[PDB]
Amino acid sequence: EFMKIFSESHKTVFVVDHCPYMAESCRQHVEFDMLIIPLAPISKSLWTCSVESSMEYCRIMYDIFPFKKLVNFIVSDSGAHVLNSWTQEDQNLQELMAALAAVGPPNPRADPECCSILHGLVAAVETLCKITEYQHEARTLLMENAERVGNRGRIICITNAKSDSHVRMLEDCVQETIHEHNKLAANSDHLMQIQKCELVLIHTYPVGEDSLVSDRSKKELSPVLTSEVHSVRAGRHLATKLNILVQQHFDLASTTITNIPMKEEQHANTSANYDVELLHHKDAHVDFETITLKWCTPRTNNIELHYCTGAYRISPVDVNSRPSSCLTNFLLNGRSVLLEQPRKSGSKVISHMLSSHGGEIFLHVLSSSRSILEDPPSISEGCGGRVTDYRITDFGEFMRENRLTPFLDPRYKIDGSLEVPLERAKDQLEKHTRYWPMIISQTTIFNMQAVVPLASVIVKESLTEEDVLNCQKTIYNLVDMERKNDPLPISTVPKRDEQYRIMWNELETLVRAHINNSEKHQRVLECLMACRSKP
Amino acid sequence: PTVVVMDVSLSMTRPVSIEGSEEYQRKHLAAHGLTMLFEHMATNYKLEFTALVVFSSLWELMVPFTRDYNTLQEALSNMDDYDKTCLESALVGVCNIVQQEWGGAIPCQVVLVTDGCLNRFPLPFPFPSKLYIMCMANLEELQSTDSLECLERLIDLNNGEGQIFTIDGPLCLKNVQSMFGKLIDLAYTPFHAVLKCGHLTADVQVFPRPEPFVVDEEIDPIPKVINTDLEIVGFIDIADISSPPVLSRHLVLPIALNKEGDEVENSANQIAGKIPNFCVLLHGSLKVEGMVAIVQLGPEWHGMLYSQADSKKKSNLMMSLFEPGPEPLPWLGKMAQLGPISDAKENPYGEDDNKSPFPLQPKNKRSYAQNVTVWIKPSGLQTDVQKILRNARKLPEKTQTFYKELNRLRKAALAFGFLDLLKGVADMLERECTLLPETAHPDAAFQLTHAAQQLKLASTGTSEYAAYDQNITPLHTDFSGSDIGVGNLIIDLDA
Ligand SMILES: [Mg+2]
């Protein structure tokens, strides 16, 4: 079988230990009082450290991958509690914070009968066998012509283990549980077997102790199951570990934007240079353990359209820090910023651009190299390039009038029939170009202000009663011009008798191009035919 | 681009015919084949850059990437007596040469002309590549010395990307011409299309010829080529397209065709120059209006036409292809749901053309666009603390933000199970109430102690304000009558 986007990244299951021992203090003091007698420096529970680290991992992932990368968050005490599901709807950090608040901190003075991390480890193996929405969609599209969609997942377990012996018992329990449950998923239609599972066992312990658990490198326990074991102090070390792990599980790289000139608005000497670090998919650095890109101060006379070979969502490492929050909101407020790849070459290299789009910040990969399209041929030396009288500004109005706009539904009714927006756009371009001379000297009527009220509505598929009146009024005015013998613009870019015959013939050409649109169109032509001068 | 790698070793001075059927040495038919290639390029593929590398004991770049096929042509007569200096594999030289100019994302074709005579290895090339080997020895000769299997290995090492060309017959001029002719047809025939905007049309070439795209060798393995009818479907302002990521960029250029499909001389582009052409109209308007034209490449595949955006370079009409699929650019939404303004209820762009329907925004806010609580770094805790205190002093003017900041810290502390923090803040607040100055609005002390008391009750966990939804409200007091270093950072646009 194959994995596409259905690798292990697709399904990640957290299993955090909520047994009474997790209420113990990480013993890393925190100074919540900066500047009499400051308050007692407090400390977080091992539980709190684990929920912090795992939520920050989930934040970074959710920013870089708002779709198709899913998480089930399970807490384990006397039983398992899965705080969300696989649906993309349920991939919401806020609802998770509420669930976590409702399980609460572990009770130190409780004796929950039969409590252990094993409850949630089973639950992890069980939910890995439930189909996601994207999995269910791919099975239903690949038919029995495949239904070899891969089903692989990852289980991240934060706990307080007893010993190396104890940790190995957990691996073996997962190993047997995957083996037995896969048999059920086999003779189950609503469940998929686990084709590969990666198990990450994170033992965390208070600062000042020596862990009873030692790191164990990745080991193949099963054709399905691989497993590894980390020992790491709670607090900032546990946090650093899950930051390293999120980058490895999702193929992320780090970029620090350097030399951002910042300052405090309510100060003077506040001018200073700052550095902000972002995470994004590693593909952003392919053209090129942190990559530095130097801030380039924005020139308001910059290029509006950049050649971009890729665009990658970012998540700031320190999202609430003052300098990152500065960079972020600058981008969010509409500004873009170009980034330079440092080189002692001398020739400055603009390799990237940061730009927000509707509130989501992408890192754009630019072209640093010479362009194979450099020095194109001159318009004047090619076909039609010796023509001096292109209706450029008239055609630009055509473009403005045929700008596209997003519609909410896949289709919308027109005449009791459902139409595709982009199809209707394409159909309008057809009507607007049935008669559209490209150069000034090839038209009389499109050089005439008096014809606009007619020419601008006759191309519509139906005419309002007001549209009809303005069409007749245009025709009536042309009769007045011919009677006054007003000069017409057919000039170089003969006899006035001929001028009007030509002008009327062209107006008739335009109208006849549209008489099949509607019966009102037909009547506009009857009016033209009756009011014009005939040879 | 193209790099011609030309063998100038001694073996290439052997006669093509020991029977004297023709007078040429191998190097002479090689130059005849290249002359044919350069002449084709010069008239049917003019925009292509070509470099010329020569090699024997050493190698040298003789002609750097150029579109001047005359200098390339003139180089052939003078290449045996050109000084070679470099001492790696010429194929190492090709790698350095290609990436030093174009980077490593541009498809280059490497044309190796030789008779075959028998750290990171250069193959497969680090860029998208074809290796075409033009054998100046016939098949029977190549087979008779196992040289044919070596050359065939090079294609294998370049993952079959490329081809060996051989003559099974007399190594004469007609056969070498036939051979380079086959290379031309395979690798240098222009891509011709029709550019359409409704009834406005122009016959065009798309340069370079776009490479056939494969999405997912499992989920969708069929290579995609762009439709030859390039249908414009609508226009979008440059500010709304906002520098989208694209697969590749192309010049789109008009071509003069005949009844026979014949691209038509010192007098032909004269009469072609006086015939109005939709490419010029479209290009000029696009530049003046600052727009792009969205173009359909095939079912669920779109791209854009636009003019050169740097105003100091020559401009001409260009096309970029988007990634295939129904929604390549999130901020535009699904291409098929882009429609005409005439069908919208109100005009999305504003009565005074001062609005835009773009960008669409994602259904859910990212974390930097939305308040999030992050307390892993002790700085991040202190800043949320000093935020609550700064507003606690400014009461009752800022009770709103005071109680917004306060309830945020309450909710996050309950989510994380960090109940000690609730008691700790509650204690800071009641110190503030103690330390208040005697000029303080009287409401400040009532709010500070009510906040500090409600915050300690949430430490209790004993289903008081301990509930996640239960926010701390200000007291409704009836008083009837009258940032320094810890503020926001801004972007210093000076220096
Ligand atoms: Mg040799």
Tab-separated table of N, CA and C and ligand atoms in Angstrom, chain B residues 7 9-11 115 117, ligand 1:
chain	number	residue	atom	x	y	z
B	7	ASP	N	33.307	16.943	-27.640
B	7	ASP	CA	34.534	16.181	-27.470
B	7	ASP	C	35.571	16.632	-28.495
B	9	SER	N	38.806	15.453	-28.337
B	9	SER	CA	39.945	14.576	-28.169
B	9	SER	C	40.448	14.073	-29.532
B	10	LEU	N	41.609	13.405	-29.486
B	10	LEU	CA	42.314	12.988	-30.694
B	10	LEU	C	41.489	12.020	-31.523
B	11	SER	N	40.824	11.063	-30.861
B	11	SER	CA	39.962	10.104	-31.548
B	11	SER	C	38.977	10.777	-32.490
B	115	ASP	N	32.524	10.448	-29.849
B	115	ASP	CA	32.630	9.156	-30.519
B	115	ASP	C	32.655	7.987	-29.540
B	117	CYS	N	34.904	6.777	-27.492
B	117	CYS	CA	36.170	6.055	-27.318
B	117	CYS	C	36.608	5.898	-25.864
C	1	MG	MG	38.313	10.171	-27.049
